[PDB]
Design a binder for this molecule. Structure first.
Ligand SMILES: CCCCCCCCCCCCCCCCCC(=O)OC[C@H](COP(=O)([O-])OCC(O)COP(=O)([O-])OC[C@@H](COC(=O)CCCCCCCCCCCCCCCCC)OC(=O)CCCCCCCCCCCCCCCCC)OC(=O)CCCCCCCCCCCCCCCCC
Ligand SMILES: CCCCCCCCCCCCCCCCCC(=O)OC[C@H](COP(=O)([O-])OCC(O)COP(=O)([O-])OC[C@@H](COC(=O)CCCCCCCCCCCCCCCCC)OC(=O)CCCCCCCCCCCCCCCCC)OC(=O)CCCCCCCCCCCCCCCCC
Ligand SMILES: CCCCCCCCCCCCCCCCCC(=O)OC[C@H](COP(=O)([O-])OCC[N+](C)(C)C)OC(=O)CCCCCCCCCCCCCCCCC
Ligand SMILES: CCCCCCCCCCCCCCCCCC(=O)OC[C@H](COP(=O)(O)OCCN)OC(=O)CCCCCCCCCCCCCCCCC
Ligand SMILES: CCCCCCCCCCCCCCCCCC(=O)OC[C@H](COP(=O)(O)OCCN)OC(=O)CCCCCCCCCCCCCCCCC
Ligand SMILES: CCCCCCCCCCCCCCCCCC(=O)OC[C@H](COP(=O)(O)OCCN)OC(=O)CCCCCCCCCCCCCCCCC
Ligand code: HEC
Ligand code: HEM
Ligand code: HEM
Lengths: 56, 74, 51, 65, 379, 98, 239, 55
């Protein structure tokens, strides 16, 4: 199973657990920030400063 | 109060299972919804009436303020 | 509560009234001295000159 | 320049609630006017009309703006 | 040779106070509020400090400094509104905690109950002095009214009021001393909370059933750490919703006006969590009687362990007592709403009836009803 | 008749729904622990198991099936004779004190 | 007595995750520049806050350079004029607060840095109050120099009617109809009261997603650890 | 008026005309349940604070 391989490759050791958490947070911060910012800009398209900097 | 001199028991057996063997959501909706409905049925006839009479009092006072506030023909 | 009162408690009260009254006098004197309570201090002879 | 606010007022004064508020308003108007020495003010019925009209106006207007 | 967790002195105290503490197995979600308040307390302190580093407690600059915090300090607005709405959440959790204690017969713990009453009084004082600091119209005039309340006390009266004021009325000196008292008090609250926990631990905790749970105690760490963490996450959800979606939901707009002593705002109401007292204030025509009723409303919690007559500790098996308690809660919301509203004919009579009912339920209805229940249950 | 009202209150209290009995829910005041201590072994064991089961049920927010509810006529006041003696002894000590 | 509460207008930012229409913010700043700043004052916000919100850096510095601002002591202690910079707060039309009352009938124009967040009702009030002027009803005479406005408490404002159609010319070229001017200036005032509005909504979106992620997982962890106790089966075997 | 405690002090000498007019003023018609001599104890010296009630 994929989950079993993930466990007894990268979850058994608590120190490996911490390393996994650290790298996962490193990537998750970027992914979540990008996604949330894209969604928020999509909702208010044309109503933010970044959408009207080109005009002026 | 630490473990060891809490109380005295005899002939009590407790069977239990590992958290890694059970499902953390065993029949979450199949059994949970009937239990919540039963609890609501047991409690509502005692909890609701004071709040509903509070709502009646609030609405009555809020409407009472305006007509005392309203113009008196004279 | 009604569990109190009766024979034994009344002479306890009588025995401790002198001490309790003396403690109340202690509190009264300490209060009037601490805040410099004028109303009383225009009557005691030597301290009248404080004001 | 034709202000969209004025046109919204015009079409939104047709709502039958506005109709009753307005007719009550003149029913205050002639009563106060004819009565020389009276302290009554038609601000009450005027406020009723203003509320009834402005809720409707708030529903409209911003679409045109 | 021995585990550090239960051999090191500080570690031993932490272990037998938060890790290996035997707690009842069936404590409901309401008990979680005990943790939340403490967390709120930390959230009140840790955020509050960061406001003290850009707030100048001077009449000429207090409001301007707060506006500077919210408009120019990097992420300052988050700190300010987090603090305000967290104080509101603190009072919400405090009221729910008192309700839990009253409901499930917890006031048999006596010492913990009295320490809790003292903590409650200190928290209300802290919030009162806190509201003044922004030096808005409502802040200034609410401080004026609440301090002028103390003029009702006989003899000393005006002298005590001006002593608090540091002058003839509220002014720069009053603002400064309010800021200093506000800074010091929460640490006293923290020490008192430590004493509260110390007193509580000697006897354990009251489970919802009210029976002794010495036969079902479980270690605290595996279960209640994560349970209270879930509770704190829920409280953070509510608090963050309040801060980031309706920051001024529980807040008068007029506090965003610089305090002008020459204009009385049309409405003078305290914070939302004081209205239940203030409404009682409005109920009693006599000023001295009003102040005595205001203090007695909160002081009545001390009488509760003496006013309990039912042979059942909890309220879980007592229906009529449950109905009475929920009527009491509804009366509390009624008092809050009445205090919110001004003082006219529709509200005066309602306030009088609400105050009378609030005292009557605690002092009369609840004990007599407990007697009725004991008689009805063959004991 | 009054017994109908007593039955109604017994059903409304709900401690029977947990399998408990009347004396299993009494608040443990200073007299109550002494009364419990004097209980015979079998009654004490049954009481402690019943209370443990009640706590188990309340942790899961569940009740016993309708069949296993302590009916009002089957409820026994096992503690009552001991509690009466403890209270009488306390009253006698108080009377000698005054 | 009586007061008329403002109707709940459908503002662009009324939405739970909506943002101020920054083009309308720019137009509202124009309105404040050539209408409200003449007698009304705004202090807590400065030209610096304009960048990245409604004006670019060049436009903001030009706007600051247009006005004249008093500075500190001269080489001999004089009060020399100076072209305003980006770090300058919006000039106050009247030097002392009493001079504002003296120039007017006697009521000082409140500062707009918080008027949206200080008046009960919000923009709906400030908008409607501008677009709510009407002839007084019969039977209520107003003093000379006073004006009747239903939404203003007391129904007696000291404003000359500030906003009327074709008062100013927007740089964009949108029609200058009175309703448009009022809406744009109201949006600008909302921005003035809450500059962090858009950022607050963005962080609120992030918080909503983060909690919708965390709460199920933490609840699952709680269920996992508590499942030892929620599945225990007791047994009693007395001899 | 002088300027004490952050408020002006509207003080008039209340010439005989003013005090007789005030005495002629009915207490009931006034919203505030107050009488002229009851508020100010000097008919020819009225001492009133500055500002105005109601903003
Ligand atoms: C205000 C301040 C801020 C909030 C403070 C919160 C403090 C408490 C925090 C911990 C907590 O929630 O404890 C209560 C309680 C503890 O019991 P539990 O872990 O839910 O287990 C079920 C109970 O045994 C009870 O089980 P049951 O007999 O009701 O049936 C099983 C289950 C199934 O029923 C449901 O889930 C209810 C229907 C909705 C689905 O019931 C529940 O889950 C009830 C809770 C509602 C969900 O948990 C909840 O109420 C769950 C919170 C909501 C779910 C997570 C977020 C999504
Ligand atoms: C469906 C119809 C509505 C059902 C809910 C309303 C109701 O009256 O239910 C009474 C019904 C019967 O009450 P009970 O379970 O016998 O007594 C309450 C438990 O002792 C103590 O509560 P619990 O531990 O059994 O259940 C915790 C419960 C409620 O948790 C709390 O009430 C404490 C924290 C939230 C405070 C209120 C926030 C709003 O959680 C929730 O309702 C969902 C998550 C809420 C935030 C986390 C907790 O209870 C429920 O349906 C669940 C608890 C109350 C929910 C409100
Ligand atoms: C006030 C605070 C906010 C309100 C309260 C809520 C706080 C957030 C939610 C709760 C978070 C608890 C911690 C996360 C879960 C957790 O680690 O539980 C301990 C769990 C409980 O035991 P476990 O069995 O789940 O994990 C350990 C066992 N192995 C390694 C096999 C998985 O233990 C660990 O996670 C140990 C390893 C931790 C590594 C941490 C690395 C951090 C790196 C960045 C710094
Ligand atoms: C609280 C204690 C008082 C704190 C402020 C100190 C001043 C004060 O309020 O009272 C001081 C007062 C001094 O004496 P005084 O009563 O003024 O004498 C003339 C009386 N016509 O002394 C007192 O008032 C003493 C009595 C105080 C307690 C009330 C009885
Ligand atoms: C609205 C109230 C909260 C929503 C849930 C409804 C509710 O409170 O139901 C009452 C509940 C009933 O369950 P239980 O505590 O077991 O009482 C005996 C039941 N036979 O009992 C309880 O929930 C008791 C909780 C008491 C403390 C919290 C409520 C009062 C808060 C006052 C502020
Ligand atoms: C500590 C353990 C956690 C405590 C609770 C944390 C806050 C709630 C957690 C759940 C929601 C999280 C939402 C979230 O993080 O959203 C993103 C947002 C920041 O978004 P943005 O401004 O766009 O920046 C992104 C790039 N950094 O994030 C935020 O705006 C954060 C949420 C608002 C602030 C809440 C802060 C609460 C805890 C404060 C702890 C302070 C500790 C200080 C220690 C001493 C420092 C000297
Ligand atoms: C132009 C775009 C505007 C806007 C948005 C506002 N004003 Fe004025 N204002 C003036 C005076 C003398 C007063 C005092 C009247 C009183 O409050 O009693 C005001 C008041 C306001 C308010 C406060 C209303 C409230 O609810 O208290 C608001 C929100 C307001 N103004 C907005 C005078 C002038 C004036 C020339 C004398 C001009 C031009 C403006 N105002 C313009 C505006
Ligand atoms: C017991 C917990 C606390 C409560 C209930 C509390 C309550 C309050 C309240 C209601 C306000 C007004 C907020 C506003 O109107 O915007 C406030 C402001 C303030 N508090 Fe606290 N506070 C607490 C703890 C602290 C602590 C520990 C400090 C010091 C570190 C502190 C410092 C301040 C400061 C400086 C302000 C002014 C900032 C502002 O304008 O909001 N507070 N507090
Ligand atoms: C400063 C705010 C307070 C804090 C931080 C605090 C802290 C705590 C904590 C952590 C608990 C254990 C968790 C729990 O049992 O719920 C607790 C229990 C208790 N508190 Fe408080 N408390 C506060 C206010 C109060 C108040 C106002 C009262 C009532 C007067 C009170 C009375 C109690 C009682 C009776 C208990 C025991 C409840 C039980 O275990 O059954 N506390 N307190």
């Amino acid at each position: 199973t994929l989950t079993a391989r993930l466990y007894s490759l990268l979850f058994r050791r608590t120190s490996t657990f911490a390393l996994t958490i650290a790298v996962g947070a490193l990537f998750f911060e970027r992914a979540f920030d990008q996604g949330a910012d894209a969604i928020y800009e999509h909702i208010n398209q044309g109503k933010l400063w970044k959408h009207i900097k080109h005009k002026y | 109060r630490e473990f060891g001199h809490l109380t005295r028991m005899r002939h009590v057996i407790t069977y239990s299972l590992s958290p890694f063997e059970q499902r953390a959501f065993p029949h979450y909706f199949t059994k949970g919804i009937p239990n919540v409905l039963r609890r609501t049925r047991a409690c509502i006839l005692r909890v609701a009436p004071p709040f509903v009479v509070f709502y009646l009092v609030y609405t009555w006072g809020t409407q009472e303020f305006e007509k005392s506030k309203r113009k008196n023909p004279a | 509560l009604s569990r109190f009162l009766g024979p034994r408690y009344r002479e306890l009260a009588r025995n401790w009234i002198p001490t309790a009254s003396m403690w109340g006098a202690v509190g009264a004197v300490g209060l009037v001295w601490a805040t410099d309570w004028r109303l009383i201090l225009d009557w005691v002879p030597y301290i009248n000159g404080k004001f | 320049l034709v202000d969209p606010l004025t046109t919204v007022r015009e079409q939104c004064e047709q709502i039958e609630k506005c109709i009753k508020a307005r007719e009550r308003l003149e029913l205050c108007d002639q009563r106060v006017s004819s009565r020389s020495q009276t302290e009554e003010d038609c601000t009450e019925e005027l406020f009723d009309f203003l509320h009834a009209r402005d809720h409707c106006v708030a529903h409209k207007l911003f679409n045109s703006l | 040779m021995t585990n550090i967790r239960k051999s090191h002195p500080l570690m031993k105290i932490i272990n037998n106070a938060f890790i290996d503490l035997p707690a009842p197995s069936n404590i409901s979600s309401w008990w979680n509020f005990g943790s939340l308040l403490g967390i709120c307390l930390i959230l009140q302190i840790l955020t509050g400090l960061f406001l003290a580093m850009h707030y100048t407690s001077d009449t000429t600059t207090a409001f301007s400094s707060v506006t500077h915090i919210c408009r120019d300090v990097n992420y300052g607005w988050v700190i300010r509104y987090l603090h305000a709405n967290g104080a509101s959440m603190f009072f919400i959790c405090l009221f729910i905690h008192v309700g839990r204690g009253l409901y499930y017969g917890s006031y048999m713990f006596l010492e913990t109950w009295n320490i809790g009453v003292v903590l409650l009084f200190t928290v209300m004082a802290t919030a009162f002095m806190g509201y003044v600091l922004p030096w808005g119209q409502m802040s200034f005039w609410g401080a004026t009214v609440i301090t002028n309340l103390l003029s009702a006390i006989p003899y000393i009266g005006t002298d005590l009021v001006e002593w608090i004021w540091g002058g003839f009325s509220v002014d720069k000196a009053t603002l400064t001393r309010f800021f200093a008292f506000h800074f010091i008090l929460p640490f006293i609250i923290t020490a008192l909370a430590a004493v509260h926990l110390l007193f509580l631990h000697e006897t354990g905790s009251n489970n919802p059933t009210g029976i002794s749970s010495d036969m079902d105690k479980i270690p605290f760490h595996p279960y209640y750490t994560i349970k209270d963490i879930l509770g704190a996450l829920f409280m953070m959800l509510i608090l963050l919703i309040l801060v980031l979606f309706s920051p001024d939901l529980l807040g008068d707009p007029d506090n965003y006006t610089p305090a002008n002593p020459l204009n009385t705002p049309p409405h003078i109401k305290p914070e939302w969590y004081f209205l239940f007292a203030y409404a009682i204030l409005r109920s009693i025509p006599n000023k001295l009687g009003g102040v005595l009723a205001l203090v007695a409303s909160i002081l009545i919690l001390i009488l509760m362990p003496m006013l309990h007559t039912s042979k059942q500790r909890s309220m879980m098996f007592r229906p009529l007592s449950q109905c009475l308690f929920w009527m009491l809660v509804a009366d509390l919301i009624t008092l809050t709403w009445i205090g919110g509203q001004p003082v006219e004919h529709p509200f005066i009579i309602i306030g009088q009836l609400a105050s009378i009912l609030y005292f009557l339920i605690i002092l009369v209805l609840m004990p007599i009803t407990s007697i009725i229940e004991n008689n009805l249950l063959k004991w | 008749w009054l017994e109908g009202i007593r039955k109604w209150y017994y059903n409304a209290a709900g401690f029977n729904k947990l399998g408990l009995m009347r004396d299993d829910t009494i608040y443990e005041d200073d007299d109550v622990k002494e009364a419990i201590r004097r209980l015979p072994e079998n009654l004490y064991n049954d009481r402690v198991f019943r209370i443990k089961r009640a706590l188990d049920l309340t942790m899961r927010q569940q009740i016993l099936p309708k069949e296993q509810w302590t009916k009002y006529e089957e409820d026994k006041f096992y503690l009552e004779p001991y509690l009466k003696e403890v209270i009488r002894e306390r009253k006698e000590r108080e009377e000698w004190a005054k | 007595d009586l007061e008329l509460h403002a109707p709940s207008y459908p503002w662009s930012h009324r939405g739970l995750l909506s943002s101020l229409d920054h083009t309308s913010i720019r137009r509202g700043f124009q309105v404040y520049k050539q209408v409200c700043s003449s007698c009304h004052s705004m202090d807590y916000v400065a030209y610096r806050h304009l960048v990245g919100v409604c004006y670019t850096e060049e436009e903001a510095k030009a706007l600051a350079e247009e006005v004249e601002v008093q500075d500190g002591p001269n080489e001999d202690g004089e009060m020399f004029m100076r072209p305003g910079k980006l770090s300058d707060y919006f000039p106050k039309p009247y030097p002392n607060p009493e001079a504002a009352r003296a120039a007017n009938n006697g009521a000082l124009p409140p500062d707009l840095s918080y008027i949206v967040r200080a008046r009960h009702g919000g923009e709906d009030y400030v908008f409607s109050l501008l677009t709510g002027y009407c002839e007084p009803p019969t039977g209520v005479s107003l003093r000379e120099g006073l004006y009747f406005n239903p939404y203003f408490p007391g129904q007696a404002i000291a404003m000359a009617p500030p906003i009327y159609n074709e008062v100013l010319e927007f740089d964009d070229g949108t029609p200058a109809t009175m309703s448009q001017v009022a809406k744009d200036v109201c949006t600008f005032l909302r921005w003035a009261s809450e500059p962090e509005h858009d950022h607050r909504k963005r962080m609120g979106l992030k918080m909503l997603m983060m909690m919708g992620l965390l709460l199920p997982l933490v609840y699952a962890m709680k269920r996992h650890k508590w499942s030892v106790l929620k599945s225990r089966k007791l047994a009693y075997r007395p001899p | 008026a002088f300027k004490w405690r952050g408020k002006p002090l509207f003080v008039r000498h209340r010439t005989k005309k003013e005090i007789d007019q005030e005495a002629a003023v009915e207490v009931s018609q006034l919203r505030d349940p107050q009488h002229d001599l009851e508020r100010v104890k000097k008919p020819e010296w009225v001492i009133l604070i500055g500002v105005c009630t109601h903003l």
